[PDB]
Amino acid sequence: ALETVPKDLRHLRACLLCSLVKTIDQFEYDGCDNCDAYLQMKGNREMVYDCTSSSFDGIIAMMSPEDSWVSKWQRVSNFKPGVYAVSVTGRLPQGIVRELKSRGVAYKSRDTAIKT
Template sequence: MALVTVLRDLRHLWACLLCSLVKFEYDGCDYCDMVYDCTSSSFDRIIAMMSPDDSWRVNNFKPGVYVVSVTGRLPQRTVRELKRRGVAYKSRDTVMKT
């Protein structure tokens, strides 16, 4: 079984603008290494993914804490790079309207 960090408070947490994974600033994201360009400290509604292998829909997710909404947008250069790689970006910011 993998060691999982338990959140003690919400200070110093950042959520990824692409995948919504919540981590400490120094831990980075399990999916990418662009912590400062692709994260925000402003987010809403925390949910936990404990056993993704037991799910029919999210079995490719990593165990951890995710948010439903994260405030902010990815930089345009990052969006272009994702598009070039065939990765569809859908903003998880429910505050900003496109």
């Protein structure tokens, strides 16, 4: 799955629902591999800006989600393989959160960062 791999290291961003690290250009051109069926990232830029942010810490090159404890720790065991962020600070919009809750998806923040 080379489509998930970012093509460069410029303006990388992390998905607030999947911790998926990807370039904003690929977010507009392709979109999140796991939020496409729920948010439809492809075809717009401003909604991508709202959904994903460039402030992220750490990178994990995950390729075997079914045989790793990191996937279990990061709640990304059932998500598609790809580069993931460790801790992301931010919150999804209230309307998007309500829509996800309506569509049977519970919003869990990825902010595992320590606040002092």
